[PDB]
Design a protein around this ligand. Structure first.
Ligand SMILES: Cc1cc2nc3c(=O)[nH]c(=O)nc-3n(C[C@H](O)[C@H](O)[C@H](O)COP(=O)(O)OP(=O)(O)OC[C@H]3O[C@@H](n4cnc5c(N)ncnc54)[C@H](O)[C@@H]3O)c2cc1C
Length: 498
């Protein structure tokens, strides 16, 4: 029942923690509620594609859903499914739906692979207590190297039909006096070229991404976690969900864990104790464990900052209708490679990525995922009745995000004489999706609910290492920042505490 160190979750913060602990010679156990994705399914593949979703695509749902923005074309392939330990979980709150990955590797399994560093000037604004020099000189470079971040061949990008959709938006943006930037990725671009040449089995060019990539994507299980297991000091137990955390009489920690099968049946409830406890259950997961512990009295010394400071990273999705003479192409790579940088740290800041359309036919639609600067924050509150943490966030709190995104795209529309599509996000005629979130951040903010290195306030040997540490916004896709911050924190923790 005892293990020196226990890491909850296997996402970015958790993976960095497990590797460094293993290298320091600390016996570590990682607990993951999802599955280890290494078993071929009914089709011979591990993951299902976006055009053939099945039970593997969803975390205990009774029917598959079309990826946001492609309902008009992909709802036709949706089918009823048996509740299963799928890879993608759509967590629905009152006025917000948060998407998160479930399994060994966490969000790295289902994300777009976009590895971007935030602007130093913005980083300094959101975390004034952290030394930006150490981060940019040592930690960010370490993260990029370990994550196996790479750059796309610009010549291939210009000629390939698979990125026609990106070139069209670049041209449209240019007229509005806007510039584009190449976004690094963890998907092997060299492998992507070989897919286009039909030399290797396709994944990114076979409409795969959101439910996992059977090839090419360097998810955490291939990078950090592979290295962690390679130390001989790390072990990962799957289909194990941590329910409660408490402090033993002597200062150690004890956890109640439920082991279930892929169908959701409770196999057993275990008790695991440890000396060092690292939380890497994500912005939603870590926060819920902590608010529950504080409010049910198992960790009564947690401060009032626990549960506060949540933000969706200003996530807003919109789409523009192209002129008949500007086709986006039927063949679009599932991995984004270009972005529009309009981030100046002001209230109108927008960092938008040019997103592909999985339709498989010409739609003339240009899809965008914008990241804006919206000061509004939500708060996680514990509901003792249902034993669940609820997110206090209203749709109107995303108005500043919508306003900023609208201002940028109105410019592009004006310069090109185009209009928005208002029929892509379900019912209503909405041009902007304002109630979804791919980047949940906050809930246990660094320096507020914890010290400047993630040591949870009020306790010793209790650490948070994930997206819950970030103050609701980073200005770009978050995983590189989560990884770099984890590197900074765990290094200090190993030196001082372990
Ligand atoms: C569709 C999609 C697209 C995105 N694209 C990008 C992109 O291209 N670039 C980018 O930078 N970011 C992207 N993101 C966001 C990025 O994936 C997340 O920011 C990142 O994965 C968060 O890391 P984390 O370490 O905080 O936690 P997560 O990676 O979310 O994982 C935490 C882990 O904890 C497990 N866990 C949760 N609670 C428990 C519990 N009680 N017991 C045991 N295990 C538990 C979860 O199952 C999970 O595996 C995207 C995400 C989505 C959903």
């Amino acid at each position: 029942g005892y293990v020196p160190a226990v890491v909850i979750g296997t996402g970015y913060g958790a993976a960095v923690s497990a590797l460094r602990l293993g290298e320091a010679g600390v016996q570590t156990l990682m607990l993951e509620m999802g599955q280890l994705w290494n078993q071929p399914g009914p089709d011979g593949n591990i993951f299902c594609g976006m055009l053939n979703p099945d039970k593997r695509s969803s975390w205990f749902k009774n029917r598959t859903e079309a990826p946001l923005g492609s309902f008009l074309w992909l709802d036709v392939v949706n089918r009823n499914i048996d509740p299963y330990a799928g890879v993608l979980d759509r967590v629905n709150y009152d006025q917000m739906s948060v998407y998160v990955g479930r399994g060994v590797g966490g969000g790295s399994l289902v994300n777009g692979g976009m590895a971007v560093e935030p602007k130093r000037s913005y980083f300094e604004e959101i975390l004034p207590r952290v030394d930006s020099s150490e981060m940019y000189d040592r930690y960010f470079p370490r993260a990029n190297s370990m994550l196996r971040v790479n750059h796309i061949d610009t010549k291939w990008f210009e000629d390939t039909e698979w990125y026609k959709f990106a070139r069209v938006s670049r041209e449209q943006a240019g007229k509005a006096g806007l510039g584009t930037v190449f976004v690094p990725n963890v998907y092997d671009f060299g492998y992507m070229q070989r897919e286009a040449a039909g030399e290797v089995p396709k994944s990114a060019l076979a409409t795969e991404v959101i439910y996992g990539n059977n090839h090419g994507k360097q998810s955490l299980d291939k990078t950090y976690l592979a290295a962690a297991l390679g130390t001989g000091k790390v072990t990962i137990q799957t289909l194990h969900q941590v329910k409660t955390i408490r402090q033993t009489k002597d200062g150690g920690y004890a956890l109640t864990v439920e082991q279930k099968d892929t169908d959701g049946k409770l196999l057993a409830t275990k008790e695991i104790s440890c000396r060092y406890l690292f939380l890497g259950a994500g912005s939603l997961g870590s926060t819920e464990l902590l608010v529950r512990a504080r409010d049910t009295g198992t960790l009564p010394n947690l401060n009032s900052e626990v549960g506060a400071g949540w933000g969706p990273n200003g996530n807003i999705m919109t789409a523009r209708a192209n002129h008949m003479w500007n086709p986006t192409g039927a063949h679009q790579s599932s991995i984004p490679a270009l972005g529009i940088d309009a981030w100046d740290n002001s209230d109108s800041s927008v960092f938008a990525e040019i997103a592909p359309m999985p339709a498989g036919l010409e739609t003339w639609v240009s899809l965008y995922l914008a990241i804006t600067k919206n000061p509004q924050r939500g708060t996680f509150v514990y509901d003792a009745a249902t034993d669940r943490a609820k997110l206090n966030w209203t749709r109107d709190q995303n108005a500043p995000a919508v306003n900023a995104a609208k201002a940028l795209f109105d410019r592009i529309n004006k310069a090109n004489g185009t209009i928005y599509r208002y029929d892509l996000f379900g019912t209503q005629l909405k041009a902007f999706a304002d109630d979804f979130c791919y980047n949940p951040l906050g809930g246990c903010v660094l320096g507020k609910a914890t010290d400047d290195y993630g040591r949870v306030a009020g306790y010793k040997n209790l650490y948070v290492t994930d997206g819950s540490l970030i103050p609701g916004s980073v200005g770009v896709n978050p995983f590189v920042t989560i990884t770099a911050l984890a590197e900074r924190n765990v290094e200090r923790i190993i030196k001082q505490d372990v």
